[model samples]
Target: MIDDMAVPLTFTDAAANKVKSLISEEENTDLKLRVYITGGGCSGFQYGFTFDEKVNDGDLTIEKSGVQLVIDPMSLQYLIGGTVDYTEGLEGSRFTVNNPNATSTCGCGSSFSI
Candidate 1:
């Protein structure tokens, strides 16, 4: 079992701003950005992002720049010491994860394995 308290997941200012803009567009004051993990991907695990209105037991709530990020227990293990950032360039724009626990990551930047 992993201790959710020890997991370190955070968002950058840019990421927080982007999430806030998205939440505003959704028109729901209670919605929050939810970051989670699920099986499958080229690297055996994939990160998922969505807006949610509910907080489950053992969920980790990280607040940054007035934005809240909700992560479940299972996903927190692989995300320890991970940072989420927003970027834009010739390639495009998106929220990316940089995880210390990841041994390898896919080129697309949404999947990783420890």
Candidate 2:
């Protein structure tokens, strides 16, 4: 029941559009994107992206552009104030996360040291 306009979370148009396309095309799949912070990048912690069908107890679910997002409790702290965005460059199109809690980040920007 969450929509892009209804959530307080931050996400860029590129990101929202990508999600919208997925949900619009495949409505029957119980697919949800999961974003988590891990401890293993060039920096101290890195971000992870994967599709999850299971929703654990007390999980934080945020929806935008018909795309659903789920975050576990442990990952919530690192992503407290961040943005999910998609970028299109000469190379290709990819999803990106902008984390403000980062003290430093690598070139890929998928992970950061907090």
Candidate 3:
């Protein structure tokens, strides 16, 4: 119902709910959504998401509404103060990141140039 109050990143309820749904569907109660940044997108950097059962040392974990979101320690350096959200549009339904440090971003919200 509640989680650690130290929030370096904003994890939207919508995104947490969707992650909960996916976890339930997969029947992996221990699964967690992992967000990381990688090079080589339309922009200089991009956000990549995956599921991992491991809670690595130095990884930041945020729990909300029975779901968990994790980020790599290195990726956290660039994504502080960012929001993780889920949205549905005519284009598609997916997870998106709104990064405050980014100077520019591609049409695809996942990519950014800082």
Which of 2 and 3 is ahead in lDDT?
A: 3
- TM-score: which candidate is best? 3
Could you give candidate 3's per-residue lDDT for residues 3-113 as a string of tens digits? 653456776787666667777788887577777875344331346666766887788877655567787876676667776677655776666665656546446666456
lDDT of 3 at 1: 41
Question: How many backbone clashes does every candidate have?
Answer: 0, 0, 0
Poorest 10 consecutive residues by lDDT, candidate 2 = 1-10
Q: Candidate 2 lDDT, tens digit per residue, 1-114?
A: 534322323556766555555655677464666656653543323356555657767667776555667766566666565666776668776655655455454457565567
TM-scores for all predictions = 0.66, 0.57, 0.68
User: Relative to the true structure, how large is the alpha-carbon lDDT of every model?
Assistant: 0.64, 0.58, 0.66
Per lDDT, what order, best first?
3, 1, 2
Q: What local lDDT score does residue 87 receive in model 3, on the 0 to 100 scale?
A: 65
Pairs with steric clashes in candidate 3: none
Q: Where does model 1 exceed 4 Å of error?
A: 1-7, 38-46, 88-90, 103-114
Ranking by TM-score: 3, 1, 2
Number of the candidate with higher TM-score, 2 or 3 = 3
Model 2 — TM-score against the truth? 0.57
Candidate 3 regions exceeding 4 Å error are 1-5, 38-46, 88-90, 103-114
Worst 10 residues of 3 by lDDT: 38-47
